[PDB]
Design a protein around this ligand. Structure first.
Ligand SMILES: *[C@@H]1O[C@H](CO)[C@@H](O[C@@H]2O[C@H](CO)[C@@H](O[C@@H]3O[C@H](CO)[C@@H](O)[C@H](O)[C@H]3NC(C)=O)[C@H](O)[C@H]2NC(C)=O)[C@H](O)[C@H]1NC(C)=O
Ligand SMILES: *[C@@H]1O[C@H](CO)[C@@H](O[C@@H]2O[C@H](CO)[C@@H](O[C@@H]3O[C@H](CO)[C@@H](O)[C@H](O)[C@H]3NC(C)=O)[C@H](O)[C@H]2NC(C)=O)[C@H](O)[C@H]1NC(C)=O
Ligand SMILES: *[C@@H]1O[C@H](CO)[C@@H](O[C@@H]2O[C@H](CO)[C@@H](O)[C@H](O)[C@H]2NC(C)=O)[C@H](O)[C@H]1NC(C)=O
Ligand SMILES: *[C@@H]1O[C@H](CO)[C@@H](O[C@@H]2O[C@H](CO)[C@@H](O)[C@H](O)[C@H]2NC(C)=O)[C@H](O)[C@H]1NC(C)=O
Ligand SMILES: *[C@@H]1O[C@H](CO)[C@@H](O[C@@H]2O[C@H](CO)[C@@H](O)[C@H](O)[C@H]2NC(C)=O)[C@H](O)[C@H]1NC(C)=O
Ligand SMILES: *[C@@H]1O[C@H](CO)[C@@H](O[C@@H]2O[C@H](CO)[C@@H](O)[C@H](O)[C@H]2NC(C)=O)[C@H](O)[C@H]1NC(C)=O
Ligand SMILES: *[C@@H]1O[C@H](CO)[C@@H](O)[C@H](O)[C@H]1NC(C)=O
Ligand SMILES: *[C@@H]1O[C@H](CO)[C@@H](O)[C@H](O)[C@H]1NC(C)=O
Ligand SMILES: N[C@@H](CC(=O)O)C(=O)O
Ligand SMILES: [Ca+2]
Ligand SMILES: [Zn+2]
Length: 875
């Protein structure tokens, strides 16, 4: 109404990107929430460095409206006359037009633009919003922001681009019962009424809009002091105060470690962490005020699993890395997002490894990031690490496996190639150089090239400017050639077009005889290279350190199987996992006969290590799901793999004994036993479940999930379903809540699963943050695979309206269709996608799940008989 929408394209505001010549220096931001009303108002003053003649000034704004006609100042101080304001929806701009036009800011003086705005706190988990929780029977409120990537513009009008760094002084007018937090410490608190307080924070260092954060809360706090002498506090509900302790410990330890590792001081005087009762992502690295989902921050040693403990530790560490990589140095544009996320996903393992020494964290990188993303990046519908993005939906989409996991994986290879010491120093120099500014990928290579003198740009560009990765083909034990690895054998290996033509500069490592050698495999060695006393066995890619797969000659693979059966310890735990992972991926890709891959599983009755079991289970889970409906194959696969885990499942038992990694092993090994239908394992689950239903017995923390799942699956009924639902409401610990939701999703009852799906529309029962988690759990249920799939179709309009097409999690929900493997199911998917063709942030996931389902159909056609023969002949 005041700044009406206009379809006027005839200006520079038609461009997706902000202009080069308008730059913010300082933001004066004031917001006043009306918490009980779900509204807020605010005014913002922005100091602007103008570089070119313009009759129009524009910046980002979404949903939140301008309420007063904005006022502009010249660097001299004079009021500039304003003809009109208008909104341009297509690119999310509010544009104001001066009568006349004005000239560049020449000296130390700047233009000043102030605008008045009003927005909503309800119906959303982005921008500035309010949510509730219960304390001593009273409903309490908390308000916070969440901006990454393009949501700062919902909170307040701003230049919402990562490279438009400005300095911030924030103030909030709030009721006095509430405290206020932001990026910086409190500077002054002044009484407005005897009811309202105005909290003003001290000036920030230069930072990006997406990092700007404020909150209004009535939380308690657990406190720690760094070696720097700076306060590190975690804000937490009084009820949950005891569960903030562990996160407090890790923050201390990892904060102290990183400041020392990066040779650079944390740029702010304090650091705060807070978990919002309803929060849309895992966690957010808002400088000095890191926000969390409760499951990623709050941990109870008496109730939470080792899995949960590691998750809290890892996310906290991840969030800390960002204080350096992301906050101090930011990417210039979202195309270089991996400079934030890859680095965070890499250093997270070093952080936690320092804090928890016997967790074998560096090895766990293989399970968490490397091997899972080698599945992703073997699809045609992957994308290069450096990604072209032209809409907010494309921007948000690239917060994915590639940015995080592949980013992490190629740094891991890079570090090993370049040696840790030099990698460390190179990172420090980069951090020194671009501090409080923005960097491109090219800048990071040059920094490490200064630190090692190795050809970093030349080599790392191949891993970064094209999607995918190579398989090394072994000829004659010693000759290797490279070829792009694709899961679909029919796919065109040259597509989509790449300047580098899908050949890589591969840093290659191998183990001769406990002795390690290194070679860079050059791109232009078109006919391959030869690996430098006379040998009978070459172990290529030790600990799967390089982002590629190795395909040995079939005779070699045969010998590996035999060697595993004789003495499996001949290979390290990591090497076993890697060989198993490669073989099964190769078999999946029709590059190795399945009988050869399956032969590697024969030794398993003697396997006792975490890493090989995890990758075995990953590979079997896929094969088993492809044959779910096959009454001939399934029992045979079940019978075999049941026999292979039985010894380790029996050996570890149903009890929380041993170190961290052992406890993780027990979880997944007992789970697989249950999955494979081991009567004794299932009876343990039922027995414990029955006891838990008696309402006193606290289950062993690392067995709970399994007990809820397989207990409910095997002996669940309405009475125990209702009980479980009550328990979920009653527990304060989010980590327990999440397990109970999985339990509820496990019942073998269409009526009860139907009730559960209906609860998704009930915001008093299922939090907005948990809807997609629940749908995904239900999709795992043998009945619910189809129910969840059908429910998202029937309720698509509802979900879009509730979340918007810009919601990443909504975009991704179609991946519940991944297990599909028939032409009928593919037709359903295509029909539904054609009916709702506006995919938003779901565009990539749609492409990916379609490719996956097409692959599944082909896979069945190619491999059913082969796999059938192997099992039939064996049993
Ligand atoms: C939870 O799972 C446990 C397995 O991990 C079950 O314990 C097993 O019960 C079996 C039957 O009671 C035993 O089988 C016997 O095994 C011995 C070999 O040591 C054989 O001689 C026998 O053929 C066989 N049956 C006999 C002699 O009647 C297992 O030995 C036993 N223990 C282990 C460690 O595997 C639990 O019963 C199960 N708990 C619940 C509540 O179901
Ligand atoms: C690598 O995988 C190979 C291919 O499956 C294995 O070789 C197969 O072993 C089976 C014995 O376990 C044989 O299958 C069947 O054996 C029964 C005996 O009970 C006979 O009746 C069947 O006739 C026979 N099947 C067929 C089709 O003849 C196979 O003889 C054999 N397959 C081949 C092609 O030789 C290897 O053992 C395995 N290598 C390892 C573990 O190192
Ligand atoms: C938050 O609540 C407000 C007010 O209830 C919502 O705006 C209303 O939307 C309904 C239904 O579309 C209309 O009938 C009302 O006239 C609107 N009220 C006002 C004051 O404009 C708003 O949609 C909610 N915000 C979000 C983001 O969902
Ligand atoms: C956080 O750190 C403290 C100290 O570093 C951990 O140690 C506890 O306190 C005493 C003495 O400090 C130790 O002897 C005990 O082993 C610890 N527990 C108890 C109950 O006293 C503490 O465990 C850490 N908090 C966690 C992991 O949540
Ligand atoms: C799934 O759960 C429903 C709900 O408990 C079961 O239906 C109940 O059946 C009993 C008798 O067996 C009746 O007394 C209840 O009134 C029924 N409830 C409802 C809502 O109809 C149903 O039997 C279960 N189905 C399976 C296959 O186990
Ligand atoms: C289990 O929980 C449900 C939900 O609270 C119970 O209540 C019935 O639920 C149906 C819908 O599923 C409603 O239409 C009925 O009005 C509810 N009946 C009431 C409130 O009395 C259900 O009765 C519970 N069953 C058991 C065995 O505890
Ligand atoms: C950096 O940290 C050191 C050691 O903790 C401290 O003494 C110093 O004040 C800091 N220097 C700067 C420039 O921030
Ligand atoms: C491997 O490559 C080298 C040099 O190109 C050649 O001498 C040798 O014959 C090749 N083949 C095998 C099986 O070693
Ligand atoms: N940066 C966030 C993602 C987001 O909030 O969009 C995370 O890593 O959890
Ligand atoms: Ca966000
Ligand atoms: Zn991150």
């Amino acid at each position: 109404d005041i700044c009406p929408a206009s379809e006027d394209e005839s200006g520079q505001w038609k461009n997706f990107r902000l202009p080069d010549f308008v730059n913010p220096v300082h933001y004066d931001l004031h917001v006043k929430p009306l918490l009980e009303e779900d509204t807020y108002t605010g005014t913002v003053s922005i100091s602007i460095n103008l570089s070119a003649p313009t009759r129009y000034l524009w910046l980002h704004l979404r949903e939140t409206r301008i309420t007063r006609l904005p006022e502009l100042k010249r660097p001299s101080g004079d009021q500039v006359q304003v003809r009109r304001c208008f909104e341009y929806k297509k690119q999310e701009y509010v544009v104001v037009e001066a009568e006349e036009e004005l000239t560049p800011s020449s000296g130390d003086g700047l233009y000043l633009l102030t605008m008045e705005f009003a927005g909503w706190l309800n119906g959303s988990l982005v921008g500035f919003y309010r949510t509730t929780y219960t304390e001593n029977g009273r409903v309490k409120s908390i308000a916070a922001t969440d901006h990454e990537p393009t949501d700062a513009r919902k909170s307040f009008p701003c230049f919402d681009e990562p490279n438009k760094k400005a300095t911030y002084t924030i103030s909030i007018t709030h009721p006095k019962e509430y405290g206020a937090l932001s990026n910086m410490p409190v500077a002054k608190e002044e009484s407005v009424d005897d009811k309202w307080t105005r909290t003003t924070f001290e000036k920030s260092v230069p930072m990006s809009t997406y990092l700007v954060c404020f909150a209004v809360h009535q939380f308690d706090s657990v406190k720690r002091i760094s070696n720097s002498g700076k306060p590190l506090t975690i804000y937490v509900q009084p009820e949950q105060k005891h569960t903030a302790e562990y996160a407090a410990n890790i923050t201390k330890s990892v904060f102290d470690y990183f400041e020392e590792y990066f040779a650079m001081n944390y740029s702010l005087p304090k650091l705060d962490k807070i978990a919002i009762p309803d929060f849309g992502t895992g966690a957010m690295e808002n400088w000095g005020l890191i926000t969390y989902r409760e499951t990623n921050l709050l941990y109870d040693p008496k109730e939470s699993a080792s899995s949960n403990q590691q998750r809290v530790a890892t996310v906290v560490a991840h969030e800390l890395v960002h204080q350096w990589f992301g906050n101090i140095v930011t990417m210039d544009w979202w195309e270089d997002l991996w400079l934030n996320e890859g680095f965070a996903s890499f250093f997270e393992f070093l952080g936690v490894n320092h804090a928890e020494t016997d967790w074998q964290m560096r090895d766990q990188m293989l399970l968490e990031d490397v091997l899972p993303v080698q599945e992703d990046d073997s699809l045609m519908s992957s994308h290069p690490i450096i990604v072209t993005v032209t809409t907010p939906d494309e921007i948000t989409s690239v917060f994915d496996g590639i940015s995080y996991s592949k980013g992490s994986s190629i740094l891991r290879m890079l570090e090993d190639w370049i040696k840790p010491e030099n990698f460390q120093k190179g990172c420090q120099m980069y951090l020194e150089k671009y501090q409080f500014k923005n960097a491109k990928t090219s800048d990071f290579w040059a920094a490490l090239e200064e630190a090692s003198r190795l050809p970093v740009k030349e080599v790392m560009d191949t891993w970064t400017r094209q999607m995918g990765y190579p398989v090394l083909n072994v000829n004659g034990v010693k000759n290797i050639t490279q070829k792009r690895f694709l899961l679909d054998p029919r796919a065109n290996p040259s597509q989509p077009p790449s300047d580098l033509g899908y050949t890589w500069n591969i840093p290659v490592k191998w183990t001769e005889d406990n002795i390690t050698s290194s070679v860079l495999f050059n791109r232009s060695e078109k006919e391959g290279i030869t690996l430098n006393s006379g040998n009978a066995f070459l172990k290529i890619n030790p600990d799967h350190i390089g982002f590629y797969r190795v395909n040995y000659e079939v005779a070699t693979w045969d010998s590996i199987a035999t060697a595993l059966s004789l003495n499996h310890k001949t290979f390290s735990s990591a090497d076993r996992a890697s060989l198993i992972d490669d073989a099964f991926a190769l078999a999946r890709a029709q590059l190795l006969d399945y009988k050869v891959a399956l032969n590697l599983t024969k030794y398993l009755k003697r396997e006792e290590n975490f890493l090989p079991w995890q990758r075995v289970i990953s590979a079997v889970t896929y094969i088993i799901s492809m044959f779910e409906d096959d009454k001939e194959l399934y029992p045979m696969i079940e019978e075999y793999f049941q026999g292979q885990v039985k010894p380790i499942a029996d050996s570890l038992g149903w009890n929380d004994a041993g170190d961290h990694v052992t406890k993780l092993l027990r979880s997944s090994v007992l789970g697989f036993a249950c999955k494979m239908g081991d009567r004794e394992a299932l009876n343990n689950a039922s027995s414990l479940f029955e006891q838990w239903l008696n309402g006193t017995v606290s289950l062993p923390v690392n067995l709970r999930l399994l007990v809820y799942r397989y207990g409910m699956q095997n002996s669940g009924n309405e009475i125990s379903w209702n009980y479980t639902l009550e328990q979920y409401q009653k527990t304060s610990l989010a980590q327990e809540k999440e397990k109970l939701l999985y339990g509820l999703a496990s019942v073998k009852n269409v009526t009860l699963l139907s009730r559960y799906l209906d609860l998704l529309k009930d915001t008093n029962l299922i939090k907005t943050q948990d809807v997609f988690t629940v749908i995904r759990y239900i999709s795992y249920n043998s009945y619910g695979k189809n129910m969840a799939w059908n429910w998202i179709q029937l309720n698509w309009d509802y979900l879009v309206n509730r979340y918007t097409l810009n919601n990443r999690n909504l975009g991704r929900i179609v991946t519940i269709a991944e297990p599909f493997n028939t032409e009928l199911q593919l037709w359903q998917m295509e029909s539904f996608f054609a009916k709702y063709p506006q995919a938003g942030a779901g565009e990539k996931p749609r492409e990916q799940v379609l490719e996956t389902v097409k692959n599944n159909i082909e896979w069945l056609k190619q491999h059913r008989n082969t796999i059938r023969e192997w099992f039939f002949n064996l049993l």
